[PDB]
């Protein structure tokens, strides 16, 4: 029932290159829908799902200019951070930013987000009150003061409660069957004779969206983490995901082992075992 929008923004300086590379990716409900890249021939925001082609040229021209402004902002900030951290020239540096908003089922604002990282590390973030800032690093305190002085929190709070909600409402009405979909995991168990006396049961879940999923094993019982290996969830490359979890077992006595697959698309958790 819930929904979100995110812009994920990155600028990267490298030793020789005159200007940094700036990339911005927007997401509705965790699916990419727009992108800008300053390396591109003639950089602009481009649609990244078919449902975004409804927006006319005035939408794209404005978004592109916002992107060019952000790239100017990341450029100056990268420069200022260099000085804040007494870093000299000839290094590589990263600045990243995360977006704005989460709605509940009723489409009202649950939370606003605004976070920045330098060299992949928390630099500064707007707290959930959308009024105060968290900055851990001694160097970050300079930004925190400057931003407290100029009422930056108010600007970002207005975006987060206003445009971010309004435009997410609009986007959700526009791609109504493209993002109101979940694919269920089809699950199966495979068998692998391993050094004698023992064997690995591998529980597979395939073809599912979104990524969040859990695979458990029970020894007829209630729990197994003692040599339960798994893999991190992985993209298949077609928009669906894949995961397995495995458990080591006595050969012969494998018919009392049960795998459970928990996914939001399921009516109830899947249950299956090795089927010879």
């Amino acid at each position: 029932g819930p929904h979100s929008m995110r812009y994920f923004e990155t600028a990267v300086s490298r030793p020789g290159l005159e200007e940094p590379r700036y990339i911005s990716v927007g997401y509705v409900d965790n699916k990419e829908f727009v992108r800008f890249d300053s390396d591109a021939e003639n950089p602009r925001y481009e649609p990244r799902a078919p449902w975004m082609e409804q927006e006319g040229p005035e939408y794209w021209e404005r978004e592109t200019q916002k992107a060019k402004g952000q790239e100017q902002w990341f450029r100056v900030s990268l420069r200022n951070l260099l000085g804040y951290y007494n870093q000299s020239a000839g290094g590589s540096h990263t600045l990243q930013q995360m977006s704005g908003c989460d709605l509940g089922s009723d489409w009202r604002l649950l939370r606003g987000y605004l976070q920045f990282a330098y060299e992949g590390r928390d630099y500064i973030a707007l707290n959930e009150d959308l009024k105060t800032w968290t900055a851990a690093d001694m160097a970050a305190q300079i930004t925190r003061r400057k931003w407290e002085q100029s009422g930056a929190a108010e600007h970002y709070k207005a975006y987060l409660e206003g445009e971010c909600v309004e435009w997410l409402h609009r986007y959700l009405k526009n791609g109504n069957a493209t993002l109101l979909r979940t694919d269920s995991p089809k699950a199966h168990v495979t068998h692998h004779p391993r050094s004698k006396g023992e064997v690995t049961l591998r529980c597979w879940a395939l073809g599912f969206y979104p990524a969040d999923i859990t695979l458990t094993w029970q020894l007829n019982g209630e729990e197994l983490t003692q040599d339960m290996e798994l893999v991190e969830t992985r993209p298949a490359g077609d928009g669906t995901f894949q995961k397995w979890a495995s458990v080591v077992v006595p050969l012969g006595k494998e018919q009392n082992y049960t795998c459970r697959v928990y996914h939001e698309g399921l009516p109830e958790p899947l249950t299956l075992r090795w089927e010879p």
């Binding site: 927007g26 925001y45 992107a67 902002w73 930013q97 971010c164 309004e166 435009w167």
Partner: peptide, 9 residues
């Protein structure tokens, strides 16, 4: 709809 940032760092 993209955010524009306020003051630089």
């Amino acid at each position: 709809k993209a955010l524009y940032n306020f003051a630089t760092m």
